[PDB]
Symmetry: C5
Subunit: 257 residues, 5 copies
């Protein structure tokens, strides 16, 4: 094990995040926007896959979607950009280890969440302009998925959000624990396969699901109300998974007591 | 050849394990709980696959499930967390090599088994909360699988547990014999593929099978009694495979006489 | 982090490109020609797959095509040759960081683009010469695809071009951010999967699509006006994606803000 | 090209093998037993696959089997254990190069062959004990394969053994020519894919095929005379493939003359 | 790093001719291994071809391409002498004045013949397994051999060109990376392209014809057919490897 080294790295990354934000809100928001859009790119890919295999009646739909989502977090980690969901574990661990404050943590979470959203809104806009969701099985996949995610009960979304961010954050944790970029990508691939195929909920990914569905004139039954309901429920779950499980857990393992 | 050095690393790992437990029961149990939960995440993924493909009558079902289970031990190894089944070989070799004692071994086995179960209990509760096993093929897949595992003859479960833990512990052994994290993950992928598709029995994975099946009000094919029956038989078989084959074996290979 | 170091690498890459171009038109155009042909090789592969699976009715067609396209940018990055689409991000970042001039940039872009085109033309001539697109599902896939791309609205092609080059350029960016050649190839595989299966537009790849179709004797029904319209719309799209998004974006991330010799972020 | 360096490595390895055997028969036999069982694990997996896909009438059966066999030699190489077929090239090259005697070679061949057999016997007994070949397509797949392998003309088996051990030994040769463990596993994956899907014959894998077939009450398609016939023919072919092609070939490339 | 790459190709060309000059046996043995290693890839993918063609699968050519990587991977990882790869290496080394034209034709002649010996040996042994006595694999060899030998010259020539661009560029990648895993991946991608696209490889065809001509399965092949295919494809391979990759890498790297 190298639990203490790992906690040191998490704490140093938390310190580095808040110093970045304090040094430049533009730099922090651009990074956050990049991460939001990168995650959204994975969504565009796997929903195209979703539409294609759904229209085909394939039993393998959710499995192929899961296998194909690795790009989302892979791009985030390989570009060193700012992802809200990953920040749940990093800021909480660093905060518990007294490297950052609670205010620092809430500031980082707020900014990366908004930045992530800006990225998703841009992607959504651009994607709608390609005409790829003007009509057909791919537009319908966005339309139906958006609707079902927005009509789920609060408790279900919350618990799905917890399990999702346990997986997002453990993949981030693995990247702090190896020097091999290939190993990092493989672990990301495995974790995101688990997330998508199992049906867990990811606030940042949902941002693109809703920006596309909402910006698309291919009607679809969503509404901003439903989008907000889902994002709030899922964000709360994500925070619990990342901070209360992963952040607290890694702190307990690594705390120089 | 390099068996001596491998035995040396195994011995040191066994020494570090008992020192951790002597230092902090909380740290040790948290690490164990993480590992039990990580293994369970693999179960949630492949049982989702099992439900999807069984429902479709696919002949590829058990093959796809085996290929998709790699995350379970990959997460454990890459996070440095405490897994009971792997401890069967490590403590065993370490004890034989006079680095730790018999009571040290029994203590580590008991705590890691219980801590792993804690992780499975937590994951099961949260998974039930997702609503993902309310009804439909995934719930059916948990219910039917838990039922069949609980009604297998003792001897069958025992021998399945032996072969399972030979594979788990050899994947752990490979991790002690390479410096490449990518190669570690590949070997784990191969061994877990063999375990799942061949039909071998893993006590720690079964903890999540039974936590989900028993916590879900939607599932009513098994009882705590059936869970205990399967867990006891499979755990005994696991111990024989990890300690009697892999532990004794690596000691013999490595013991500088 | 580590964005500053990444910015320094992009800027050095930019300076090296204009330098080599200044030194030898021949060296630069051959490098660009290789890159154009390498990308086209990917097209020849996935369009053969397109033809095969389309004629078979498969629903996995576009997924298998996406999974099989990695060779295109993998070859470019592993041979270190000049690809127009990638040059958008590198030249703009370097220029913004005041390592290369606006003049240097539109030059590299011009030479790389044309050089990429030469490669596609030569590949197209040779491929048709194999007789593999004399008749049948593959020849048609080339034909029908060429027609559909040349008959889409500007807006659509533009935005498809933006998204395409975001992905092309981010894979180039990953290659600057790791020392693992395997991780580089894996990131390329993922990005190109996303590009092809999602349906984004790549100018350099389109160069080979139209060269084959305009060289193939199985008639056409696309025409040269269509091709150039496409390459124009997609190229502008590509430029915005790579220069406006990736170039400016990486500049902002990496530019050490003391300096400040000129502009202040907030 | 590094042909001399490669022969120098093969020669050191031959020396180290005979020294080990001379030092401890128990260590040498235990190591050989492990390698036999590890290869056998590959057989249990791919024959499970065989039964599943053959029962389903799948055309991809032999392809998936080949893709799934990599674990057999991957485990042997990553654990550093003694495999008879690999020793055909190593001992012969080291013998030609005067690092070891002809008698050392005979000794190593006989001991590893028998030790491999012990591992296969042990694996077979335990596998039968699982109830996994009690009845159904997997048992039938063992029964049918064991029978066809036993009824082939000597000539056919012999030449199949030559090509098999060209592939086993070249994968071993690859492992001497790289420092990348991931590259070693990939080359093993490719070679074993070629062996299984093409239909070549591996003596050590066949030990497990026949141990299961002869230990399972539900398998009556073959006799001990039949196993012995196949094993002799295939062993002879393996020896020619490994020693006369790979051993002599690598000696010729590397010998400073 | 074009200059360093050209230096590497030049040093590889020099070491090849030096080797041949020192020992024809060592050089021919190495060439025979490379021919057999490439042939092993053919045995595997033609087994796949027979299996899937018999089943009417639209994935046949795709699965074959994905499964051919072993052919050049064995060559590169064993350090053996492959004719097609020597088209780029010797030409680059020659233009860079490390070796002569005479050296090049010599290395080409010896590796081609050595590759062929490896293919003949493999074909004989494979026929001896009984695996092509009858059935869809035997049929796949016979039909493929016949189709390749009945193609027009021009078609074979151009397919040979694209094939060796891919073979040689995979070799080029191996000179431009220190990662053995990256080398294998690049080889996997290039061979996937070669096989699935339908390009022509002289050395691989050596095994196709040695198997088909040694096997009991009746084909319309004939030795005259094989030789015709091999000549046309070899010239195409030479053009692709020497004129494109050889000349190209020299131009990229030459410090002038
Ligand atoms: C272009 C869009 C910019 C969005 C900026 C959002 C910043 C919100 O502001 C932050 O929110 C937290 C809780 O609400 C507080 O605890 C922080 O102190 C506060 O800075
Ligand atoms: C909240 C979780 C508490 C876990 C406590 C586990 C303690 C088990 O206790 C152990 O049991 C063994 C026998 O099975 C003994 O041999 C060990 O000596 C003993 O320490
Ligand atoms: C040891 C393996 C996992 C043990 C999980 C124990 C959880 C049992 O708990 C209860 O059992 C009831 C009836 O069977 C269920 O109906 C209830 O949902 C559940 O509360
Ligand atoms: C699932 C199969 C994916 C294979 C990816 C392997 C990538 C490993 O990583 C690569 O290979 C070597 C690792 O041992 C290193 O030497 C290289 O530097 C590195 O590029
Ligand atoms: C469990 C016991 C198995 C032991 C295997 C015994 C095989 C030894 O037997 C012999 O050894 C000689 C050299 O010492 C060789 O010359 C002979 O070839 C070999 O048959």
């Amino acid at each position: 094990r190298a639990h203490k080294e790992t906690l040191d790295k998490l704490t140093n990354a938390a310190i580095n995040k808040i110093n970045l934000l304090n040094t430049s809100k533009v730099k922090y928001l651009v990074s956050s926007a990049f991460a939001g859009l990168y995650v959204g790119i994975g969504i565009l890919l796997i929903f195209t896959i979703g539409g294609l295999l759904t229209d085909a009646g394939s039993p393998m739909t959710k499995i192929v979607m899961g296998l194909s989502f690795a790009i989302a977090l892979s791009l985030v980690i390989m570009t060193g950009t700012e992802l809200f969901t990953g920040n749940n574990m990093v800021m909480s661990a660093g905060m518990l280890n007294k490297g950052v404050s609670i205010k620092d943590t809430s500031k980082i979470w707020a900014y990366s969440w908004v930045g992530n959203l800006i990225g998703a809104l841009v992607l959504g806009i651009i994607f709608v302009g390609t005409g790829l969701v003007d009509k057909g099985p791919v537009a319908e996949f966005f339309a139906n998925t958006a609707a079902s995610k927005a009509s789920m009960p609060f408790t279900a979304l919350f618990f799905r959000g917890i399990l999702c961010n346990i997986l997002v954050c453990v993949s981030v944790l693995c990247s702090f624990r190896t020097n091999s970029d290939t190993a990092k990508i493989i672990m990301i691939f495995l974790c995101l396969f688990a997330i998508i195929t199992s049906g867990f909920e990811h606030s940042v990914a949902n941002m693109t699901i809703y920006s596309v569905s909402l910006f698309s004139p291919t009607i679809s039954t969503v509404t901003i109300g439903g989008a907000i309901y889902n994002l709030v429920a899922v964000t709360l779950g994500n925070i619990v998974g990342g901070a209360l499980f992963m952040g607290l857990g890694t702190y307990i393992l690594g705390k120089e007591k």
